[PDB]
Amino acid sequence: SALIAMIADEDTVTGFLLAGVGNVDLRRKTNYLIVDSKTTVKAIEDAFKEFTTKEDIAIVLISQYVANMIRFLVDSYNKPIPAILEIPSKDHPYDPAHDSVLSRVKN
Template sequence: MIGDDDTITGMLLAGCGNVDEKRNSNFLVVDAKTSHAQIEEAFNKFTKDPRISILVINQYIAHEMRGTLDKWAELGEKRPAILEVPSKEHPYEKALDPVYQRTKLLLGLRD
């Protein structure tokens, strides 16, 4: 998981987080002090971890690192699945959702 404090807290309460004995976690809390490099480092770490099947990321964070996500998708990787979710402070924007855009194109839908 890569997300804001509220999203990560909710996922942890749902039992989705893990911190091992070496203090390695499967989540990154992003705030104003988190650098783009830190986010990319976590993304690369999580996408290479064979134990992770779904990577949940806030949509606004995914939008900020769209180039990295696009490069990863171009590699044809199927695992983990990337799930972009809205956050409390940044509501869902269908124009930024690549799954919605592909579905809209496939079905010939208009906004």
């Protein structure tokens, strides 16, 4: 259906948000904009548990797991389809840590 990050490095996210339509997976109309680092990205995990899990958006995004604060979404490993994400670099190289799906994928 769609995939809402609502928090990331946003450098590649803006270029991967939308060009012609699809409302950037409703990240603009609903949820939150892909831009992050202004606030805690634990709210991103909360939105993924709320908005992404609401069947509107399949996946999410978090960067490098260092400042991504994705340890709150560590329990989100169960039910992989509502909460599936892989840490890219996007100028912040991925660091293996407790995240949404990083621990399960690494294991």
